[PDB]
Amino acid sequence: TATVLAQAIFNEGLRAIASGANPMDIKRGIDKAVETVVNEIKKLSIPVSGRKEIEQVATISANNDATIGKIIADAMEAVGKDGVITVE
Amino acid sequence: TATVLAQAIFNEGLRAIASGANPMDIKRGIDKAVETVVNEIKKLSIPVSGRKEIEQVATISANNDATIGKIIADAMEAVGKDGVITVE
Amino acid sequence: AAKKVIYGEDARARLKAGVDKLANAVKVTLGPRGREVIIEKKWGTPVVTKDGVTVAKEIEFKDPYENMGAQLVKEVASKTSDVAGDGTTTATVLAQAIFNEGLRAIASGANPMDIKRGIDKAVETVVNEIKKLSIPVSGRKEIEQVATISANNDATIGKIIADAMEAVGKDGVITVEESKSAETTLETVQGMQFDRGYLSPYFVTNPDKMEAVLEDPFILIYEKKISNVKDLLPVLENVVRAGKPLLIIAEDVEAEALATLVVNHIKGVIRACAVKAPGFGQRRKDYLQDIAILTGGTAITEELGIKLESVTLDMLGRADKVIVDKDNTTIVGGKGSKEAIQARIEQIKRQILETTSDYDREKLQERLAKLSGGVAIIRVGAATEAELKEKKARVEDAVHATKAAVEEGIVPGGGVALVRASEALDNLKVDNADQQLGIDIIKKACRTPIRQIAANSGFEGYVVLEKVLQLGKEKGKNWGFDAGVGDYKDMVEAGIIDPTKVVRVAIQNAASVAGTMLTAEALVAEIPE
Ligand SMILES: Nc1ncnc2c1ncn2[C@@H]1O[C@H](COP(=O)(O)OP(=O)(O)NP(=O)(O)O)[C@@H](O)[C@H]1O
Ligand SMILES: [K+]
Ligand SMILES: [Mg+2]
Ligand SMILES: [Mg+2]
């Protein structure tokens, strides 16, 4: 996702610069927009309640693999909040 | 003048297209701009008053030659406003 | 001569290169807003065109094997245009789409024979759906719309063509002729024309316009010569003592006859003129009655050809308006006996139409349409002779396309008809996986021309295609995408319609040429130089 975003910003920035815009001011405008976006993201955030969100996050990150999500959800439950999970 | 203008429009048009602009939308903007420019040209123009402006135009039309401009201006005066002038 | 043969995949690769090079140049001109193609003219200014037919006519490649694919598609695409008017660029676009997708399926290991069977089955389903989607032409409104779309979206040409069909009728002929006028005009003449004109130029009444129309003519058709002084003087003296304006039609021209008439015209005694001998063979009998349609007099034939003159009360021959040109004459008016010999009009409508199956209808129409009420001539005007050339050709195609629309009906334009027809391929199923691949090849191909039109106008093709598919269920089947202005609307209501014959022939012809090239195994060409 970060690589896709980086290409999109660079491609759109080149088009704006080709129209005669100042590159330094474009960078300043980009910095201001990201601060607003990050603040809006934090407002949209939801705290993790329990095992349901943990299993759902693990399943999605594992490319929709329910078997991996169940194991990781069990692993976090056993080790608690201060535990460390290792993959071998 | 037409050759100079044609190169300027073509070179700048290719630069815009190379940056990712839609060529069809570029032509629409070019057509709209030309219509505005032509209308402003008509507003800026003034009618020819008499022999003074006719002589000036003929002089500029030639290689800035006053003798040719005077001869042409006299030809229009003698012939009239609806005759023909032949170069032999 | 020594020849080089290319086998198997190498042979099809050569054809693909030739087809792609031809299609890529042609397909950019598809739609009302096609891109420009610049063609070099030797020792002259380059020609800029968006026609597509003009671009295809100039395409030829040095490589004989690549030229094989280009010429094969060009010949098939031309056949589509010849039969139904438009469809040259659409057939080329469809042929490339089917061929490219077919090669990809074969490259994956599919059976080429099974692919062709699936392609044939899909085309039959698409054609049937096209017929269901078509509607009959109602009247002048749809005829004008079809003619406008058939041309370069020109309303003036569409109006002229629609008026020509209205005046001529449902079974006549419309001719497109040369001119130098600054504007295009419509010329309509009552009666019938003749393929020949002046026998002698001395008959001309006014040299400036070179016209020698005769008022209240008394024409003398002869199935015999009857052109000597002995053969004509009793005819002449009877005409002289009657004062009837003279027209002499004979088996051939005589120097003696014209010499005395030129002298007579100089003397002014007799209103003499002649149209030599138009037609050949049994065509005379039709021509004999053609004047009898209008002058109301019996034909002289050979019965009155003998005895040196019509003695009995035969061949009144009394017209009132006859036109003459260099190689053209028109008999326009007269006292009229149309209804009496309308049985022969019924006869040719009953007999010659019955024997049309031998493909002699061109001779029948060339007789029937002239024997009909009248014909109209399209007069073409442009800036340059080169500009006059392609406009004249475009008008002829628009007339042919309009005729095809009346014959079979109309369908929504802009590639919508193929998109709607391709929707029925989703439910079509076969028991063979490879035949299923051929069905999907046609479905993708049917949705290609609409994307090309959108791409040419400056829009994303796949976005337009998705919107058109959605609008089929939300609004209706006739809803599509307009390319002149970037909005979606009802194509049938907006007047952007195409003949259903054009769509039907284009898909059938494109699939036919693509199918043969898919199974081609060898290319034989002479070694250059
Ligand atoms: N305003 C329009 N909006 C959308 N599609 C249009 C419009 N006008 C015409 N078309 C479609 O564009 C196609 C005609 O474009 P054209 O480039 O003439 O194709 P062709 O008839 O196959 N080629 P040619 O034989 O050279 O006339 C048809 O499918 C028309 O239905
Ligand atoms: K076009
Ligand atoms: Mg100058
Ligand atoms: Mg066309």
XYZ file of C-alpha atoms and ligand atoms in Angstrom:
739
model
C 0.000 0.000 0.000
C 2.834 2.410 0.815
C 4.496 1.731 -2.545
C 1.195 2.276 -4.370
C 0.663 5.553 -2.506
C 4.213 6.711 -3.266
C 3.760 6.152 -7.005
C 0.422 7.988 -6.988
C 1.842 11.041 -5.201
C 4.882 11.217 -7.485
C 2.835 10.805 -10.671
C 0.327 13.487 -9.665
C 3.104 15.780 -8.459
C 4.855 15.561 -11.824
C 1.655 16.642 -13.584
C 1.281 19.634 -11.256
C 4.929 20.639 -11.708
C 4.606 20.318 -15.492
C 1.912 23.020 -15.274
C 4.424 25.452 -13.751
C 3.754 24.984 -10.036
C 6.501 25.565 -7.485
C 7.898 22.203 -6.279
C 8.640 23.552 -2.792
C 5.078 24.792 -2.272
C 3.695 21.474 -3.541
C 5.747 19.679 -0.884
C 4.435 22.071 1.774
C 0.871 21.461 0.611
C 1.466 17.708 0.711
C 2.742 17.935 4.293
C -0.337 19.882 5.410
C -2.712 17.421 3.730
C -1.080 14.394 5.372
C -1.426 15.962 8.827
C -5.162 16.365 8.228
C -5.413 12.820 6.846
C -3.574 11.302 9.820
C -5.797 13.206 12.258
C -8.905 11.986 10.428
C -7.565 8.418 10.511
C -7.106 8.586 14.289
C -10.674 9.855 14.694
C -11.914 6.922 12.589
C -9.919 4.399 14.643
C -11.625 1.868 16.914
C -9.904 0.222 19.910
C -9.480 -3.544 19.946
C -12.081 -5.092 22.245
C -11.036 -8.745 22.422
C -10.353 -11.991 20.581
C -12.854 -11.234 17.803
C -10.925 -8.245 16.448
C -7.603 -10.031 16.994
C -8.702 -13.045 14.949
C -10.211 -10.838 12.234
C -7.035 -8.757 11.885
C -4.821 -11.852 11.755
C -7.043 -13.542 9.161
C -7.029 -10.527 6.830
C -3.272 -9.974 7.124
C -2.664 -13.671 6.368
C -4.438 -13.313 2.984
C -7.802 -14.567 4.292
C -6.433 -17.670 6.038
C -8.687 -18.633 8.943
C -6.289 -21.336 10.165
C -3.487 -18.808 10.681
C -5.843 -16.319 12.322
C -7.098 -18.860 14.854
C -3.565 -19.886 15.855
C -2.354 -16.306 16.324
C -5.471 -15.384 18.306
C -4.782 -18.348 20.593
C -1.114 -17.342 20.851
C -1.924 -13.806 22.017
C -4.482 -15.119 24.515
C -1.924 -17.450 26.104
C 0.980 -14.982 26.330
C -1.155 -12.035 27.422
C -0.389 -8.408 26.672
C 3.324 -8.521 27.572
C 4.098 -11.774 25.755
C 6.323 -12.258 22.724
C 5.347 -14.375 19.706
C 8.072 -16.004 17.602
C 7.678 -17.700 14.211
C 9.954 -20.590 13.243
C 3.737 34.422 -38.063
C 1.473 31.428 -38.715
C 4.480 29.098 -38.897
C 5.867 30.474 -35.624
C 2.493 30.133 -33.896
C 1.957 26.605 -35.234
C 5.297 25.412 -33.849
C 4.622 27.035 -30.468
C 1.203 25.397 -30.096
C 2.425 22.005 -31.320
C 5.509 21.928 -29.084
C 3.578 22.958 -25.968
C 0.726 20.594 -26.813
C 3.088 17.624 -27.026
C 4.626 18.560 -23.670
C 1.186 18.581 -22.033
C 0.310 15.222 -23.604
C 3.639 13.733 -22.505
C 2.722 14.631 -18.912
C -0.514 12.626 -19.157
C -3.091 15.186 -20.300
C -6.057 14.073 -22.384
C -5.432 15.168 -26.005
C -9.160 15.608 -26.665
C -9.517 17.904 -23.650
C -6.400 19.811 -24.731
C -8.006 20.547 -28.105
C -11.205 21.747 -26.418
C -9.213 24.179 -24.288
C -7.260 25.291 -27.355
C -10.476 25.910 -29.299
C -12.012 27.897 -26.435
C -8.876 30.018 -26.015
C -8.686 30.800 -29.740
C -12.318 31.949 -29.777
C -11.615 34.323 -26.885
C -8.432 35.606 -28.549
C -10.223 36.247 -31.854
C -13.009 38.161 -30.098
C -10.459 40.314 -28.264
C -8.668 40.971 -31.565
C -11.888 42.327 -33.080
C -12.372 44.595 -30.057
C -8.806 45.910 -30.338
C -9.106 46.652 -34.065
C -10.108 50.085 -35.357
C -11.495 51.005 -38.800
C -9.154 52.524 -41.357
C -9.595 56.297 -41.484
C -8.097 57.271 -44.841
C -4.915 57.599 -46.879
C -2.694 57.894 -43.793
C -3.453 54.410 -42.461
C -3.607 52.864 -45.946
C -0.104 54.147 -46.693
C 1.177 52.867 -43.340
C -0.280 49.383 -43.872
C 1.183 49.101 -47.376
C 4.603 50.208 -46.115
C 4.574 47.614 -43.321
C 3.217 44.927 -45.661
C 6.245 45.383 -47.926
C 9.843 45.228 -46.647
C 9.256 48.489 -44.758
C 9.562 50.368 -48.057
C 8.040 53.851 -48.119
C 8.181 54.148 -51.916
C 6.062 51.020 -52.407
C 3.621 52.129 -49.716
C 3.164 55.551 -51.303
C 2.623 54.024 -54.755
C 0.038 51.546 -53.458
C -1.766 54.219 -51.427
C -1.984 56.459 -54.497
C -3.297 53.532 -56.553
C -6.170 52.927 -54.125
C -6.994 56.648 -54.055
C -7.079 56.966 -57.850
C -8.829 53.663 -58.595
C -11.426 53.953 -55.829
C -12.916 51.645 -53.225
C -14.172 48.890 -55.554
C -11.712 48.694 -58.470
C -8.772 46.439 -59.267
C -5.033 47.121 -59.081
C -2.742 45.077 -61.329
C 0.988 44.474 -60.835
C 2.857 44.267 -64.137
C 9.067 -19.319 -59.888
C 10.830 -20.315 -56.676
C 8.562 -20.115 -53.635
C 9.061 -20.122 -49.868
C 6.608 -21.907 -47.561
C 5.961 -21.101 -43.893
C 4.393 -23.779 -41.698
C 2.429 -23.983 -38.480
C 2.816 -21.397 -35.738
C 5.236 -19.353 -37.844
C 2.588 -19.041 -40.566
C -0.037 -17.777 -38.115
C 2.474 -15.396 -36.522
C 3.019 -13.727 -39.903
C -0.738 -13.332 -40.377
C -1.143 -11.848 -36.893
C 1.528 -9.224 -37.591
C -0.137 -8.218 -40.853
C -3.630 -8.099 -39.359
C -2.462 -6.066 -36.357
C -0.650 -3.507 -38.516
C -3.740 -3.027 -40.689
C -6.192 -2.949 -37.779
C -4.163 -0.585 -35.580
C -4.117 2.103 -38.275
C -7.780 1.633 -39.208
C -9.322 1.236 -35.746
C -8.246 4.704 -34.552
C -10.767 6.256 -36.967
C -13.754 4.311 -35.613
C -16.684 6.355 -34.360
C -17.783 9.950 -34.915
C -14.630 11.310 -33.221
C -11.912 9.126 -34.688
C -8.302 10.232 -34.678
C -6.553 11.589 -37.754
C -4.496 9.432 -40.118
C -2.068 11.225 -42.442
C -1.393 9.666 -45.853
C 1.516 10.763 -48.031
C 0.719 12.040 -51.520
C 3.608 12.049 -53.978
C 4.709 15.569 -54.971
C 1.792 17.100 -53.071
C 0.394 17.983 -49.676
C -0.415 15.119 -47.284
C -4.018 13.984 -46.896
C -5.578 14.023 -43.417
C -8.567 11.710 -43.041
C -10.748 9.988 -40.452
C -12.644 7.817 -42.938
C -11.097 4.403 -42.297
C -12.138 3.163 -45.727
C -9.639 5.618 -47.217
C -6.944 4.410 -44.810
C -7.629 0.749 -45.601
C -7.441 1.380 -49.354
C -3.844 2.628 -48.998
C -2.584 -0.200 -46.762
C -0.047 -2.568 -48.323
C 3.049 -4.158 -46.803
C 6.360 -5.247 -48.299
C 6.412 -8.617 -46.531
C 4.284 -11.032 -48.612
C 3.231 -13.097 -45.588
C 2.221 -10.073 -43.514
C 0.473 -8.744 -46.622
C -1.507 -12.001 -46.715
C -3.276 -11.203 -43.452
C -3.844 -7.545 -44.308
C -5.336 -8.311 -47.725
C -7.515 -11.158 -46.422
C -9.093 -8.909 -43.788
C -9.327 -6.011 -46.252
C -11.172 -8.156 -48.802
C -13.643 -9.423 -46.194
C -14.143 -5.952 -44.703
C -14.787 -4.553 -48.185
C -17.382 -7.273 -48.802
C -19.239 -6.145 -45.676
C -19.329 -2.573 -46.991
C -20.402 -3.645 -50.485
C -23.381 -5.681 -49.273
C -24.816 -3.269 -46.698
C -23.034 0.084 -46.995
C -21.232 0.795 -43.727
C -19.279 -1.645 -41.564
C -15.751 -1.624 -43.015
C -13.988 -0.429 -39.861
C -16.239 -2.428 -37.525
C -15.539 -5.661 -39.413
C -11.789 -5.003 -39.288
C -11.938 -4.304 -35.543
C -13.985 -7.448 -34.901
C -11.711 -9.595 -37.080
C -8.608 -8.533 -35.147
C -10.329 -9.144 -31.804
C -11.425 -12.669 -32.746
C -8.072 -13.560 -34.312
C -5.986 -12.270 -31.396
C -8.130 -14.013 -28.776
C -8.274 -17.204 -30.832
C -4.486 -17.386 -31.081
C -4.153 -16.907 -27.317
C -6.535 -19.807 -26.675
C -4.642 -22.004 -29.148
C -1.308 -21.045 -27.571
C -2.647 -22.368 -24.253
C -3.252 -25.804 -25.797
C -6.887 -25.612 -26.913
C -8.082 -27.543 -29.952
C -8.416 -25.165 -32.941
C -11.214 -27.263 -34.458
C -13.256 -27.122 -31.246
C -12.620 -23.375 -30.964
C -14.104 -22.818 -34.425
C -17.187 -24.836 -33.463
C -17.661 -22.661 -30.387
C -17.094 -19.535 -32.473
C -19.682 -20.663 -35.031
C -22.247 -21.450 -32.326
C -21.704 -18.097 -30.601
C -22.085 -16.149 -33.853
C -25.380 -17.894 -34.631
C -26.712 -16.924 -31.199
C -25.494 -13.335 -31.628
C -27.112 -13.031 -35.065
C -30.435 -14.333 -33.735
C -30.323 -11.838 -30.860
C -29.541 -9.040 -33.329
C -32.682 -9.872 -35.313
C -34.741 -9.824 -32.107
C -33.320 -6.429 -31.114
C -33.998 -4.869 -34.526
C -37.185 -2.922 -35.244
C -38.734 -2.095 -38.642
C -38.230 1.369 -40.081
C -41.308 3.520 -39.494
C -40.960 6.364 -41.995
C -39.007 9.460 -42.987
C -37.801 10.103 -39.426
C -35.762 6.899 -39.159
C -34.660 7.022 -42.810
C -33.221 10.508 -42.292
C -31.478 9.411 -39.085
C -29.877 6.372 -40.743
C -28.628 8.430 -43.693
C -27.153 11.038 -41.343
C -25.307 8.397 -39.306
C -24.183 6.577 -42.460
C -22.467 9.755 -43.663
C -19.958 11.698 -41.542
C -22.802 12.718 -39.214
C -23.904 15.298 -41.792
C -27.498 16.489 -41.465
C -27.548 18.101 -44.919
C -26.647 14.831 -46.655
C -29.154 12.897 -44.555
C -31.961 15.321 -45.385
C -31.148 15.165 -49.107
C -31.075 11.356 -49.128
C -34.309 11.110 -47.130
C -36.043 13.466 -49.567
C -34.715 11.445 -52.510
C -36.224 8.226 -51.146
C -39.537 9.980 -50.449
C -39.820 11.377 -53.980
C -38.535 8.318 -55.854
C -40.555 5.756 -53.895
C -39.929 2.350 -52.372
C -38.670 0.549 -55.498
C -36.801 3.115 -57.627
C -33.140 3.999 -58.068
C -31.192 6.957 -56.672
C -28.114 8.005 -58.651
C -25.143 10.032 -57.393
C -23.701 12.240 -60.128
C -20.808 14.614 -60.771
C -20.982 18.404 -60.509
C -18.933 21.534 -59.834
C -21.512 23.471 -57.794
C -20.417 24.912 -54.454
C -23.249 23.060 -52.672
C -24.880 19.654 -52.970
C -28.373 19.623 -54.473
C -31.087 17.072 -55.220
C -32.316 16.630 -58.800
C -35.584 14.753 -59.352
C -37.100 14.076 -62.780
C -40.411 12.430 -63.634
C -40.486 9.594 -66.144
C -37.458 7.603 -67.289
C -33.969 8.368 -68.562
C -32.133 6.919 -71.555
C -28.470 5.911 -71.660
C -27.804 7.955 -74.829
C -28.133 11.579 -75.869
C -27.563 13.775 -78.915
C -27.334 12.177 -82.334
C -26.090 15.516 -83.717
C -25.144 18.736 -81.887
C -26.907 20.950 -84.453
C -30.260 20.310 -82.735
C -29.161 22.378 -79.716
C -31.574 25.255 -79.133
C -29.202 27.273 -76.923
C -25.441 26.595 -77.138
C -24.704 28.169 -73.741
C -26.723 25.488 -71.929
C -26.342 22.976 -74.805
C -29.930 21.791 -74.160
C -32.408 20.954 -76.931
C -35.576 19.994 -75.069
C -38.546 19.579 -77.411
C -42.091 20.662 -76.575
C -45.036 18.379 -77.351
C -42.743 15.893 -79.139
C -43.954 13.280 -81.613
C -41.268 10.608 -81.282
C -40.731 8.050 -84.054
C -39.248 4.813 -82.720
C -38.358 2.214 -85.352
C -37.343 -1.415 -84.949
C -36.118 -1.122 -88.557
C -33.649 1.392 -89.979
C -36.044 3.725 -91.849
C -33.411 6.425 -92.323
C -33.055 6.967 -96.086
C -34.732 9.787 -97.996
C -37.269 7.340 -99.439
C -37.911 5.840 -95.996
C -38.241 9.241 -94.295
C -39.750 11.709 -96.789
C -43.296 10.227 -96.708
C -42.858 10.128 -92.933
C -41.384 13.636 -93.049
C -43.991 15.045 -95.441
C -46.803 13.542 -93.356
C -45.162 15.110 -90.302
C -44.575 18.303 -92.308
C -48.241 18.456 -93.316
C -49.171 17.704 -89.688
C -46.587 19.922 -87.978
C -45.787 17.402 -85.249
C -42.399 17.940 -83.551
C -40.127 15.184 -84.812
C -38.009 12.703 -82.867
C -36.448 9.858 -84.862
C -35.381 6.668 -83.070
C -33.957 4.004 -85.369
C -31.802 0.872 -85.427
C -28.706 2.920 -86.309
C -27.501 6.362 -87.358
C -27.562 7.501 -90.993
C -25.433 10.308 -92.405
C -28.105 11.092 -95.004
C -30.794 11.507 -92.338
C -28.821 13.912 -90.142
C -27.552 15.932 -93.116
C -31.056 16.824 -94.300
C -32.283 17.464 -90.743
C -29.360 19.799 -90.024
C -30.281 21.587 -93.251
C -33.927 21.452 -92.160
C -32.995 22.781 -88.713
C -31.040 25.593 -90.377
C -34.096 26.179 -92.563
C -36.248 25.713 -89.455
C -38.917 23.717 -91.296
C -39.182 20.765 -88.892
C -38.453 20.311 -85.173
C -36.105 17.386 -85.733
C -33.937 15.529 -83.223
C -32.681 11.997 -82.648
C -31.336 9.839 -79.807
C -29.695 7.175 -82.030
C -30.407 3.700 -80.591
C -30.305 3.151 -76.822
C -30.449 -0.382 -75.487
C -29.839 -3.761 -77.090
C -31.725 -6.959 -77.823
C -35.098 -7.600 -76.203
C -34.694 -4.399 -74.157
C -36.372 -2.601 -77.076
C -39.783 -4.110 -76.275
C -39.598 -2.616 -72.788
C -38.470 0.665 -74.364
C -41.316 0.421 -76.885
C -43.877 0.394 -74.075
C -41.939 2.926 -71.966
C -42.883 5.675 -74.412
C -46.328 4.067 -74.663
C -46.612 4.636 -70.899
C -46.469 8.370 -71.478
C -47.356 9.257 -75.078
C -50.333 6.885 -75.010
C -49.632 5.581 -78.522
C -49.022 2.017 -79.644
C -45.460 0.967 -80.400
C -44.355 0.991 -84.034
C -42.129 -2.104 -83.592
C -41.417 -3.789 -86.941
C -45.089 -3.926 -87.976
C -45.116 -0.195 -88.714
C -41.413 -0.435 -89.527
C -42.479 -2.183 -92.713
C -44.613 -0.241 -95.238
C -42.109 2.642 -94.815
C -44.536 4.478 -92.506
C -47.206 3.892 -89.878
C -50.345 3.913 -92.028
C -53.008 2.811 -89.540
C -54.093 4.760 -86.452
C -50.987 3.737 -84.533
C -48.260 5.536 -82.568
C -49.806 8.805 -81.503
C -46.431 9.429 -79.859
C -47.621 12.699 -78.307
C -45.446 13.619 -75.328
C -44.985 17.098 -73.864
C -41.539 17.161 -72.176
C -38.353 15.399 -73.323
C -34.827 16.159 -72.099
C -31.509 15.644 -73.892
C -27.839 15.577 -72.855
C -24.561 14.400 -74.395
C -25.148 10.738 -73.481
C -28.480 10.977 -71.643
C -32.095 11.717 -72.543
C -35.167 11.871 -70.314
C -38.792 11.503 -71.400
C -40.722 13.315 -68.687
C -44.330 13.953 -69.640
C -47.096 13.232 -72.096
C -50.786 12.453 -72.365
C -50.211 9.307 -70.310
C -51.317 5.672 -70.400
C -49.675 4.480 -67.184
C -52.649 2.473 -65.898
C -53.211 0.515 -69.126
C -49.679 -0.914 -69.276
C -49.499 -1.111 -65.491
C -50.436 -4.737 -66.145
C -46.958 -5.067 -67.647
C -45.720 -3.310 -64.505
C -47.645 -6.035 -62.694
C -46.260 -8.597 -65.158
C -42.611 -7.718 -64.513
C -43.464 -7.503 -60.812
C -44.980 -10.983 -61.177
C -42.731 -12.627 -63.790
C -39.271 -11.039 -63.659
C -39.382 -10.845 -59.859
C -40.220 -14.562 -59.922
C -37.061 -15.321 -61.938
C -34.895 -13.031 -59.771
C -33.249 -16.100 -58.187
C -30.667 -16.267 -61.001
C -29.270 -12.954 -59.650
C -30.505 -11.034 -62.703
C -32.312 -8.500 -60.490
C -29.755 -5.863 -61.501
C -31.106 -6.083 -65.053
C -34.698 -6.152 -63.782
C -34.289 -3.140 -61.490
C -32.421 -1.294 -64.245
C -35.630 -1.853 -66.239
C -38.287 -1.772 -63.503
C -36.985 1.296 -61.654
C -36.746 3.274 -64.894
C -40.218 2.017 -65.862
C -41.397 3.211 -62.424
C -42.748 6.701 -61.761
C -39.411 8.497 -61.767
C -35.824 8.697 -60.579
C -33.746 11.224 -58.656
C -30.129 12.303 -59.116
C -27.885 13.332 -56.222
C -25.728 16.329 -57.149
C -22.426 16.530 -55.265
C -20.324 19.613 -54.605
C -17.035 20.085 -52.759
C -13.951 22.296 -52.746
C -11.392 20.202 -54.650
C -11.664 17.259 -57.019
C -10.023 15.074 -54.367
C -12.513 16.409 -51.815
C -15.256 15.781 -54.385
C -14.118 12.168 -54.828
C -14.545 10.782 -51.299
C -17.730 12.766 -50.657
C -19.301 11.218 -53.761
C -18.221 7.749 -52.624
C -19.519 8.446 -49.111
C -22.914 9.553 -50.456
C -23.241 6.354 -52.505
C -22.483 4.238 -49.430
C -25.013 6.217 -47.384
C -27.663 5.553 -50.041
C -26.800 1.845 -50.000
C -26.864 1.800 -46.191
C -30.268 3.512 -46.164
C -31.664 0.891 -48.549
C -30.358 -1.909 -46.321
C -31.980 -0.293 -43.276
C -35.395 -0.413 -44.958
C -34.849 -4.020 -46.052
C -34.107 -5.475 -42.608
C -34.568 -2.794 -39.926
C -32.454 -0.705 -37.576
C -30.611 -1.288 -34.303
C -29.136 1.115 -31.736
C -25.745 2.406 -32.822
C -22.435 2.936 -31.099
C -21.803 -0.778 -30.658
C -24.749 -1.132 -28.274
C -26.424 -3.752 -30.476
C -23.426 -6.086 -30.221
C -23.226 -5.508 -26.457
C -26.891 -6.435 -26.013
C -26.518 -9.455 -28.303
C -23.425 -10.655 -26.426
C -25.409 -10.766 -23.168
C -27.237 -13.891 -24.366
C -23.903 -15.727 -24.625
C -23.745 -15.879 -20.819
C -26.539 -18.474 -20.718
C -25.259 -20.357 -23.775
C -23.481 -23.529 -22.667
C -21.680 -26.403 -24.383
C -20.354 -29.758 -23.201
C -16.816 -29.053 -24.478
C -14.380 -26.797 -22.636
C -12.649 -25.657 -25.835
C -15.981 -24.790 -27.466
C -16.733 -22.727 -24.358
C -13.504 -20.822 -25.020
C -14.703 -19.969 -28.523
C -17.969 -18.646 -27.097
C -16.076 -16.378 -24.698
C -13.897 -15.187 -27.593
C -16.962 -13.905 -29.450
C -18.404 -12.316 -26.299
C -15.192 -10.346 -25.777
C -15.056 -9.431 -29.472
C -18.664 -8.208 -29.553
C -17.858 -5.743 -26.759
C -14.711 -4.423 -28.471
C -16.133 -1.854 -30.969
C -17.932 0.084 -28.221
C -14.681 0.384 -26.255
C -12.812 1.547 -29.363
C -15.401 4.263 -30.022
C -15.153 5.466 -26.418
C -11.346 5.354 -26.517
C -11.219 7.363 -29.753
C -13.477 10.085 -28.335
C -11.220 10.358 -25.281
C -12.927 8.220 -22.611
C -11.945 5.042 -20.796
C -13.350 2.146 -22.798
C -13.909 -0.307 -19.953
C -15.646 2.308 -17.794
C -18.016 3.122 -20.664
C -18.684 -0.572 -21.308
C -19.531 -1.206 -17.649
C -21.940 1.745 -17.566
C -23.660 0.590 -20.763
C -24.067 -2.921 -19.340
C -25.586 -1.510 -16.145
C -27.939 0.783 -18.080
C -29.296 -2.220 -19.984
C -31.069 -3.384 -16.823
C -31.656 -0.025 -15.121
C -33.081 1.853 -18.124
C -33.409 -0.369 -21.188
C -31.689 -2.203 -23.996
C -31.612 0.836 -26.302
C -29.644 2.892 -23.757
C -25.993 3.402 -24.636
C -23.116 5.886 -24.816
C -23.057 8.889 -27.146
C -19.607 9.760 -28.489
C -20.337 13.160 -30.041
C -21.147 14.438 -26.553
C -19.869 12.469 -23.584
C -23.181 11.437 -22.033
C -25.357 8.332 -21.875
C -28.760 8.423 -23.552
C -31.252 6.345 -25.508
C -29.574 5.766 -28.868
C -32.812 4.944 -30.706
C -34.513 8.070 -29.355
C -31.408 10.179 -30.039
C -31.294 8.973 -33.651
C -27.900 7.247 -33.336
C -28.985 4.035 -35.064
C -27.429 1.570 -37.493
C -28.980 -0.832 -40.006
C -29.337 -4.320 -38.578
C -27.919 -5.691 -41.836
C -24.623 -3.875 -41.231
C -24.205 -5.350 -37.745
C -25.259 -8.835 -38.861
C -22.900 -8.938 -41.850
C -19.951 -7.402 -39.989
C -19.905 -10.011 -37.215
C -20.460 -12.907 -39.632
C -17.761 -11.751 -42.054
C -15.238 -11.002 -39.298
C -15.737 -14.415 -37.692
C -15.458 -16.098 -41.097
C -12.075 -14.597 -41.998
C -10.752 -15.058 -38.455
C -11.801 -18.711 -38.426
C -9.969 -19.512 -41.659
C -6.810 -17.761 -40.455
C -6.914 -19.630 -37.133
C -6.615 -23.018 -38.867
C -4.251 -21.878 -41.633
C -1.250 -24.210 -41.699
C 0.869 -23.021 -44.640
C 1.607 -19.809 -46.535
C 2.970 -20.050 -50.084
C 4.564 -16.962 -51.629
C 7.171 -16.305 -54.292
C 10.677 -15.397 -53.163
C 11.053 -11.630 -53.744
C 13.296 -10.576 -56.634
N -22.743 10.021 -32.189
C -22.358 8.744 -32.083
N -22.181 8.215 -30.869
C -21.798 6.947 -30.762
N -21.552 6.083 -31.728
C -21.733 6.624 -32.931
C -22.128 7.925 -33.200
N -22.211 8.135 -34.550
C -21.876 6.995 -35.078
N -21.573 6.038 -34.148
C -21.164 4.656 -34.369
O -19.894 4.629 -34.937
C -19.816 3.599 -35.928
C -19.525 4.182 -37.293
O -18.229 4.724 -37.390
P -17.325 4.459 -38.747
O -15.947 4.923 -38.408
O -18.053 5.045 -39.940
O -17.462 2.854 -38.774
P -17.733 1.925 -40.167
O -19.095 2.370 -40.609
O -17.495 0.495 -39.755
N -16.552 2.523 -41.179
P -16.792 3.246 -42.802
O -17.119 2.008 -43.636
O -15.458 3.905 -43.139
O -17.945 4.241 -42.660
C -21.140 2.836 -35.802
O -21.091 1.729 -34.971
C -22.088 3.938 -35.366
O -23.186 3.374 -34.712
K -14.880 8.079 -38.531
Mg 5.426 40.540 -44.032
Mg -19.489 4.729 -41.330
